[PDB]
């Protein structure tokens, strides 16, 4: 690992601390009274694909 | 953005009906209740870019301490302009320039 | 030698101008563990330090053996290379708290800029 850069980078990634807040960009709260469907149109396709 | 009560000017907190399954903005100081238009109750930006270009005034061309360039205006193609960096002053802030024309007074970049 | 020193300082200032343009067009490489502003400041400071060292080295190579400052520096009794550089070629960059002169006014160092 000391003479190889890729394995060293793998070890570095495995050591460094990473929280959810680091990768998160924005969080939102929405009102949706239908458990099996949704009001948002952008995500409607993906969630209906999941449920089906 | 949050709305205010139309009768006693207090804040309209969101409320949910168990029987009707609707989102309603209701004032806790009275019985007033108005139907909500959007379900976006709350939004938090961990990384934000607001205030970077929001610090702009319409009289910034009268400041004598600002540098003057000859960059081309995208709208009226003037030959004089005034530039400055980002008004946000965090440690992560970029060093990109904002140019202001002396005729249309709009803010535009160089990219 | 004065022509050579002036050429070195002018070339360094042109290099600093190029670094400024690159940082103002998002074309600057970020040193790991440091922000864009910190990397830009460090790179400009390194360029200016190299400029002063090059000008001083030119000035110190110019000196004859009969030069008295050279004789004192070579004896090791008083003075060093930086003294010759600052006396003859260039004083260099002034650092306050390990950084260049800050913007004590509103976004400038003096009301003459
Ligand atoms: Zn009310
Ligand atoms: Zn214009």
Q: Which of C36, C106, C111 lies nearest to residue B94, judging by beta carbons? A: C36
Inter-CA distances, B37 with A30, B23, C97, Å: 12, 8, 55
- Strand (E) or helix (H) holding B16: strand B13-16
**Domains of chain B by range and CATH?**
1-44 (2.20.25.10), 45-111 (2.20.25.10)
The answer to whether the CB atoms of C25 and B111 lie below 8 A apart is yes
Question: Are the beta carbons of B8 and B27 closer than 8 angstroms?
Answer: yes
- Method for this entry: cryo-EM
Give all strands (DSSP E) within B28-110, no chain letters.
33-35, 40-45, 68-69, 81-84, 98-101, 107-108
The answer for B15, left when phi > 0, alpha when psi is -120 to 50, beta otherwise, is beta
For Cα atoms A22, A25, A28, give the angle at the middle one, nearest 5 degrees: 125
Q: Name every residue whose Cβ is closer than 8 Å to that of residue B79 and which is 6 or more positions away in sequence.
A: B70, B72
Contact B96 C24 (CB under 8 A): yes
Nearest to B46 among A24, A29, A33 (CB): A24
3-state SS assignment for residue B23? strand
A 9-48 residues with CB below 8 A of B?
Answer: 21, 24-33, 39
Best A21, A22, A28, A39 member to test B by mutation, with max B CBs in 10 Å, is: A28
Resolution (A): 3.4
* Token pair in block for residue C68: 């008295």
State the smallest CA–CA distance between residue C94 and chain B in angstroms. Answer: 23
Provide the 8-state DSSP code for C30: P
B39/B37 Cα distance (integer angstroms): 7
Q: In angstroms, how far is CA C32 from the centroid of its own chain?
A: 24
- B residues 14-33 lying closer than 8 A (beta carbon) to C: none
Largest CA distance in chain C: 52
Distance of alpha carbon B11 from alpha carbon B5, whole angstroms: 6
Tokens for B31? Answer: 């019985």
Q: How far apart are CA B93 and CA B101, in angstroms?
A: 23
Long-range contacts of C109-113 (CB under 8 A, 24+ apart): C111/B65
CA–CA dist A51, B9 (Å, integer): 44
The C-alpha atoms of residue C89 and residue C59 are separated, in whole angstroms, by 6
A26-30 and B68-69 as β-strands: parallel, antiparallel, unpaired?
Answer: unpaired
A31, B16 contact by CB (below 8 A):
yes
- Closest-CA distance of chain B to residue A15, Å: 24
Structure tokens at C17: 């101008």
Rounded alpha-carbon distances, angstroms, from residue B99 to B49, B73, B96, C32 = 18, 9, 10, 31
Q: How far apart are CA B34 and CA B39, in angstroms?
A: 14
């Amino acid at each position: 690992i000391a003479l190889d850069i890729e394995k060293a980078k793998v070890i570095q990634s495995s050591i460094e601390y990473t929280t959810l807040k680091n990768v998160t960009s924005a969080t939102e709260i929405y009102y949706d009274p239908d458990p099996t469907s949704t009001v948002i149109e952008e995500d409607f396709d993906t969630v209906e694909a999941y449920f089906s | 953005s949050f709305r205010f009560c139309l009768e006693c000017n207090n804040m309209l907190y969101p409320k949910e009906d168990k029987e009707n399954q609707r989102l309603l903005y209701s004032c806790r100081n009275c019985d007033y209740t108005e139907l909500a238009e959007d379900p976006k109750v709350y939004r938090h930006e961990l990384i934000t870019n607001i205030g970077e270009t929001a610090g702009i005034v319409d009289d910034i061309g009268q400041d004598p301490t600002l540098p003057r360039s000859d960059k081309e205006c995208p709208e009226c193609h003037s030959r004089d302009c005034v530039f400055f960096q980002s008004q946000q002053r965090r440690k992560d802030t970029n060093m990109t320039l904002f140019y202001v024309c002396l005729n249309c007074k709009k803010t535009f970049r160089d990219e | 030698t004065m022509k050579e020193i002036t050429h070195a300082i002018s070339s360094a200032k042109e290099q600093v101008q190029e670094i400024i343009y690159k940082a103002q067009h998002n074309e600057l490489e970020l040193k790991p563990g440091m922000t864009l502003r910190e990397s830009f400041e460090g790179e400009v400071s390194r360029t200016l330090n190299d400029a002063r060292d090059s000008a001083g080295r030119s000035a110190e190579m110019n000196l004859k053996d009969l030069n008295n400052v050279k004789q004192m520096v070579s004896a090791g009794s008083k003075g060093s290379f930086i003294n010759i550089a600052q006396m003859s070629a260039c004083v260099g960059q002034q650092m306050v708290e390990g950084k260049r002169i800050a913007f004590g006014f509103a976004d400038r160092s003096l009301p003459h800029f």
